[PDB]
Design a protein around this ligand. Structure first.
Ligand code: CL
Ligand code: MG
Ligand code: MG
Ligand code: MG
Ligand code: MG
Ligand code: MG
Ligand code: MG
Ligand code: MG
Ligand code: MG
Ligand code: MG
Lengths: 43, 120, 244, 226
RNA sequence: UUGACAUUGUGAAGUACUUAUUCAAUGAAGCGGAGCUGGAAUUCAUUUUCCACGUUCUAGCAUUCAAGGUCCCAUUCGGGGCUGAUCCGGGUU
RNA sequence: GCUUGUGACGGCCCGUGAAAAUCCACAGGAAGGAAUAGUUUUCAUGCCAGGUCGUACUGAUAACCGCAGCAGGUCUCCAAG
RNA sequence: GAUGGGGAAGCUCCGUUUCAAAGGCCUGAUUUUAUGCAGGCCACCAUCGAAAGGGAAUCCGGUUAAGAUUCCGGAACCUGG
């Protein structure tokens, strides 16, 4: 992997070469919904 | 007050270290070069098999010191004979001596250098 | 005679434990500020098999209170604990399966496992599969708690000793017969070199106190006193009674 | 103003990582430091016999300051100053046929444990200063009783290093005055009366009182609430 | 294994303490006391006391001496105090 | 069809079947950078160097061990009709 | 299997991160000279142990009485700079 270009080792998205698309989708949905729930729990 | 210590671990403090200033020399006479050019190259090898490489392969065969590596052999050949070296291959013979295959560049001929040294 | 078999095990040459495939020592978290004041939440990442241990192990990851990083712990999983479950450990934790609480914060009759003998030793009691500890009473003065052990013994433990709510998973393992010598071989292959076992009466007198004779018999009482020395303690040691 | 925002951090249990605080109380010190502080504790937790406990009382700041002012007027001659005396004495008696008495009689503080003890036994010391910091305490533990029996006023002063400064040494551990110039005689008499009221006159009752027995901070709070 | 003596001190009465010794853990992190805030609570003059004092639908995220507030530098690209984050004792528990 | 490699699956366990060096990606945003000019050596091309020791042959009814040129013993790969 | 420590009259024994003040690469500071001096980072704390485990990178043709994936011819690749 130290001899090939970076384009071979990543995907143009957050968490490109680490997590798949579905897991990234769940991370974004979970992050948004929980933070919204925290606001209504504060009030 | 007291110094604020954010870490509970105590470590050895760094102190000044002085360099040596001896009152007398360790040996007072440096040794001369232990491997000069005349020690790296011992003598050419003049067997029938070695003579064919001189005529055909443009290769000079030498017996060299057991302590010499490929860097030293290349440097010695250039200084002793005023030639250019393409690459050096070495081996340790069954009798305990080291043999070096020295191939010269195309600008030089191994045949005319060999008879200039004196062996054929 | 010569050194008998049970004397040779203390040298620990070929009788050491086989620990290549072990997942790691199963311990609770180190008792820190969060445990004794409030609670800290952990996440179960996976439940894995451990060689040489009947009960499964649970991998729980906590956040480091004083540094930006993650800390991983190896717990003995209780029944009902699943991957992705939040685990709460501390003084102010709730009474739910998998939560770690001190014995003084649970009511009488609570079922607990991986119980600390003393606060901070990270679990000593009720660790084998299917075993548990029952809380039977409390002594608010002098900070003591009475518990019932799997062997039936009653013990008095400090109320600051921690325990895990539930029962160790993997119960009912010993109810299936091994059914052949091969299965016993593979069982002890991952534990230690104690199988097979040769009977002492089948040996020679030089080898075992039960050895020798024109018939295969013991010759003297098999009940041995507590004061006997090494090389004599073969049979039933300090038996209060024998027979069915 | 409209670009900066207030984002307070929650430092509660299970919240954001704790900030860097002062942990000097919890520092794991080297062994020599820990043995140094625990020996100090051990010497006060246990009962102290009166022979040793009498050294906890030291001269107060005002009286000690007055004492050192008088002792500083009788510094021993330095090595450099001794050079001038010898070259002057040599040029005086050797050539001038003198009687080796061309120099005035010196006045200096007497020091040295063996020397001072001999002076006390001969009733020659007018005032003796005793250091309370001598680690092999047996070297100085009997001096208050010896001074009391011989009738020589004594004071337990704070600092063996301080006594060394007035004798051009690192440490002296004892000092004494035998002869004082007439112009300073009245000053010495004021110090003797003040010093006697603190050590010599209280010797009888101090010998009957034990020291030590002090509990730790946590033990003291536990003992109060019981 | 059992007894005696030594290690071996301190307080009381007809068991109590701590300091020696012993056990255990933490790359010795939050111990002890007090002061704040509220809660329960009944006051027989005021608090005679106790509890609590940022985190629990969710397999997300949490790091740059911390943003903010305030006070200085001699203004430049920045820097240094206090507070944020209560005091006191240095007995790591 | 044979030998072998590999893929997706299925059966089995009170047995669930190494470790570390090493390499990469992501999260984070400390710094560093443009207008008469700079950064990219994870895009292409071009330049230099890569030491030291082993390397022949037998591997067995004659090159190893059994007193030996001993019907004994001694790990493994390739496999035609 | 050393060290720090603790045993043993002693040859030596225990122990391997242990009741230890156990160490160095990113730079900034300096154009007296070489690195003293400022923040922060990291505490992992010797070493030995596989020619069948892990592991950066080469192939074909030709050549000798006896060597070759090592020599010759041609064609590639990796690491460091
Ligand atoms: Cl046996
Ligand atoms: Mg070679
Ligand atoms: Mg038999
Ligand atoms: Mg027998
Ligand atoms: Mg018998
Ligand atoms: Mg060969
Ligand atoms: Mg042979
Ligand atoms: Mg050893
Ligand atoms: Mg090695
Ligand atoms: Mg060949």
């Amino acid at each position: 992997y130290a001899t090939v270009s970076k384009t071979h080792k990543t995907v143009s998205r957050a968490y490109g070469g680490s997590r798949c698309a579905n897991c990234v989708k769940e991370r974004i949905i979970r992050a948004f919904l929980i933070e919204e729930q925290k606001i209504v729990k504060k009030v | 007050a007291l110094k604020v210590r954010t870490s509970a671990t105590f470590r050895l403090p760094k102190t000044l270290k002085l360099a040596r200033a001896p009152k007398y020399a360790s040996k007072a006479v440096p040794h001369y070069n232990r491997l000069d050019s005349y020690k790296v190259i011992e003598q050419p090898i003049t067997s029938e098999t070695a003579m064919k490489k001189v005529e055909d392969g443009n290769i000079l065969v030498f017996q060299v010191s057991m302590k010499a590596n490929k860097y030293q052999i290349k440097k010695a050949v250039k200084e002793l004979y005023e030639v250019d070296v393409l690459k050096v291959n070495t081996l340790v013979r069954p009798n305990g001596t080291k043999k070096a295959y020295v191939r010269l560049t195309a600008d030089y001929d191994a045949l005319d250098i060999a008879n200039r040294i004196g062996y054929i | 005679g010569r050194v008998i078999r049970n004397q040779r095990k203390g040298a620990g040459s070929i009788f050491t434990s086989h620990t290549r495939l072990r997942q790691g020592a199963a311990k609770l978290r180190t008792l820190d500020y969060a445990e004794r004041h409030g609670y800290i939440r952990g996440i179960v990442k996976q439940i894995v098999h451990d060689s040489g241990r009947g009960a499964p192990l649970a991998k729980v990851v906590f956040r480091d209170p004083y540094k930006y990083r993650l800390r991983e712990e190896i717990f003995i999983a209780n029944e009902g604990v699943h991957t992705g479950q939040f685990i709460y450990a501390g003084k102010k934790a709730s009474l739910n399966v998998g939560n770690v609480l001190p014995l003084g914060s649970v009511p009488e009759g609570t079922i607990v496992s991986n119980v600390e003998e003393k606060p901070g030793d990270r679990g000593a009691l009720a660790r084998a599969s299917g075993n548990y500890v029952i809380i039977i009473g409390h002594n608010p003065d002098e900070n003591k708690t009475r518990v019932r052990l799997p062997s039936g013994a009653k013990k008095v433990i400090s109320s600051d000793a921690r325990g895990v709510i539930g029962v160790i998973a993997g119960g009912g393992r010993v109810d299936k017969p091994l059914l052949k010598a091969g299965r016993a071989f593979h069982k002890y292959r991952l534990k230690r070199n104690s199988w097979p076992k040769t009977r002492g009466v089948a040996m020679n007198p030089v080898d075992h106190p039960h050895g020798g004779g024109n018939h295969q018999h013991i010759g003297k009482a098999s009940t041995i006193s507590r004061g006997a020395v090494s090389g004599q303690k073969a049979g039933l040691i300090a038996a209060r009674r024998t027979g069915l | 103003n409209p670009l900066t925002h207030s984002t307070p951090k929650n430092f509660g249990i299970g919240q954001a990582v704790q900030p860097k605080r002062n942990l000097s109380r919890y520092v794991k010190w080297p062994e020599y430091v820990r043995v140094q502080r625990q020996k100090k504790i051990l010497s006060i937790r246990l009962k102290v016999p009166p022979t040793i406990a009498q050294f906890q009382y030291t001269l107060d700041r005002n009286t000690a300051a007055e004492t050192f002012k008088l002792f500083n007027k009788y510094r021993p001659e330095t090595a450099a100053e001794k050079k001038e005396r010898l070259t002057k004495e040599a040029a005086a008696v050797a050539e001038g046929k003198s009687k080796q008495d061309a120099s005035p009689k010196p006045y200096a503080v007497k020091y040295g444990l063996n020397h001072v003890v001999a002076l006390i036994e001969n009733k020659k010391a007018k005032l003796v200063l005793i250091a309370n910091d001598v680690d092999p305490i047996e070297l100085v533990v009997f001096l208050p009783a010896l001074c009391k029996k011989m009738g020589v006023p004594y004071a337990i002063v704070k600092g063996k290093a301080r006594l060394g400064t007035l004798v051009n040494q690192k440490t002296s551990a004892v000092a004494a005055l035998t002869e004082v110039r007439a112009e300073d005689e009245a000053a010495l008499a004021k110090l003797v009366s003040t010093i006697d009221a603190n050590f010599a006159d209280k010797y009888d009752e101090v010998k009957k009182h034990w020291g030590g027995g002090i509990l730790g901070n946590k033990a003291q709070a536990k003992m109060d609430k019981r």
